[PDB]
Structure 1
Amino acid sequence: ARVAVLISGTGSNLQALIDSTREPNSSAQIDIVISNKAAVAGLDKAERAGIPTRVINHKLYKNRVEFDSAIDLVLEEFSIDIVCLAGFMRILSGPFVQKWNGKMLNIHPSLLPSFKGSNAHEQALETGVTVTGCTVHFVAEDVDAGQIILQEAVPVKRGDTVATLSERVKLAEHKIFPAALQLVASGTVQLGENGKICWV
């Protein structure tokens, strides 16, 4: 399966996916990395790995649908089968999500359905949980509400900050996102017709 990875930043999840998809038994190959932001570290990581990159600046588009169309054009250019959102911080439009239904994965740094949205660690710390984690899910129109593929729990330590908690949770992200991508790319896991996850 042919994979696009979309990023907005550092790209540690991208690097874990690069490492995993290059193992001999990988069912996935990363053929394009797309960032909505120029000069982010994730682009350096892709270049170093010899993977093509494109920058599609959302600021240059009239609306969300036009931006998504620009992304979709590149996905078609590279005959992409599966899209991974790896620190990509834009909400995708309904039609784009429907087109890629069952083919687009996101990583989120909480145990969904807790702490949906952009500041999950801040929320976890404010709430006072002692266990948080991360989730890989299929992308549905409603943000952070699509079908869950894998999750991993991560403890919150007393005195944690966003800095220390995000660091700990990223170790788990780098485990489950490669594992989830392999499950989908190999056809082991798919989005069922009834909308529920299906393990074959």
Structure 2
Amino acid sequence: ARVAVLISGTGSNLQALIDSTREPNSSAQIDIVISNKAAVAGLDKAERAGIPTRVINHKLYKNRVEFDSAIDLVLEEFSIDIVCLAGFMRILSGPFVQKWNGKMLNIHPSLLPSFKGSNAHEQALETGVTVTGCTVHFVAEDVDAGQIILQEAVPVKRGDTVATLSERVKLAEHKIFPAALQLVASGTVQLGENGKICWVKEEHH
């Protein structure tokens, strides 16, 4: 499966994703990284790895649909099968999300449905949970909604700061984002017609 990663900044987890695709039995290749912001660190990561990049500036389009249609056209040109979001900071239009339904994935540094929105590590610490984690899900129109693919629990440790908890969750993300991509790329996990996750036994052995 040919994979695009959409970014707005540092492309957190992009290197984890790249490294995974270069493993022997990978079902995925990262074929393009698209940013809506020029000269961000995640583009340099992609470029250093020899992956094509594009920059699409939302300010050049009259509205969100026209902007997302420009993104889609690049994805079309590059024959992309699967999209991963890695810190993409523009809300994608209903028509875009619908088109890419069941083929676009993203990650959030909580055990959803807890700690929706920004600053989930601070939310966890403020709340005083002893277990948090990260969640990879299919992207839906509503932020943080969308069917869950994988989750991994991560402990909160007495004395943790936002920084120390964040690095522990990031280590889990580095594991589960590529694991989830491989599940979706191999076809092992697919989104059912009923809108629920389907774990598929594949014909080819």
* TM-score bin (small chain): over 0.9
| 2-structure distance, mates of 1:86, 1:29 | 16
Indicate how the Cα distance of structure 1 residues 58 and 123 shifts in structure 2: closer, same or farther if over 3 A, else same.
farther
TM-score, with structure 1 as normaliser:
0.95
Shift of 1:62: 3.0
Q: Deviations over 1:52-108 (max 9, x none)?
A: 011122344332212211111110110100000012222211110000001100011
The residue matched to 1:173 in structure 2 has which SS? helix
> Identity of paired residues, percent?
100
| 2-structure distance, mates of 1:165, 1:116 | 17
User: Superposition RMSD on alpha carbons, in Å?
Assistant: 1.2
More off after superposition, 11-20 vs 53-62? 53-62
| 1-structure distance, mates of 2:40, 2:139 | 24
Q: Deviations over 1:127-182 (max 9, x none)?
A: 11111110000111121110000011111123323222211111000100100000
Shift of 1:38: 1.7
Shift of 1:29: 0.7
- Is the contact made by 1:36 and 1:58 (CA closer than 8 Å) also made in structure 2? yes
The residue matched to 1:12 in structure 2 has which SS? coil
More off after superposition, 58-67 vs 105-114? 58-67
Q: Which runs of 5+ in 1 are unaligned?
A: none
Q: How many equivalent residue pairs?
A: 200
Q: Which runs of 5+ in 2 are unaligned?
A: 201-205
| 1-structure distance, mates of 2:181, 2:108 | 14
| 1-structure distance, mates of 2:74, 2:6 | 11
The residue matched to 2:159 in structure 1 has which SS? coil
More off after superposition, 26-35 vs 160-169? 160-169
- Is the contact made by 1:13 and 1:87 (CA closer than 8 Å) also made in structure 2? no
Indicate how the Cα distance of structure 1 residues 113 and 39 shifts in structure 2: closer, same or farther if over 3 A, else same.
same
- Mapping 1:18-167, distance limit 5 Å: 18-167=18-167
| 2-structure distance, mates of 1:116, 1:73 | 31
| 2-structure distance, mates of 1:109, 1:123 | 11
| 2-structure distance, mates of 1:137, 1:195 | 12
Indicate how the Cα distance of structure 1 residues 126 and 63 shifts in structure 2: closer, same or farther if over 3 A, else same.
farther
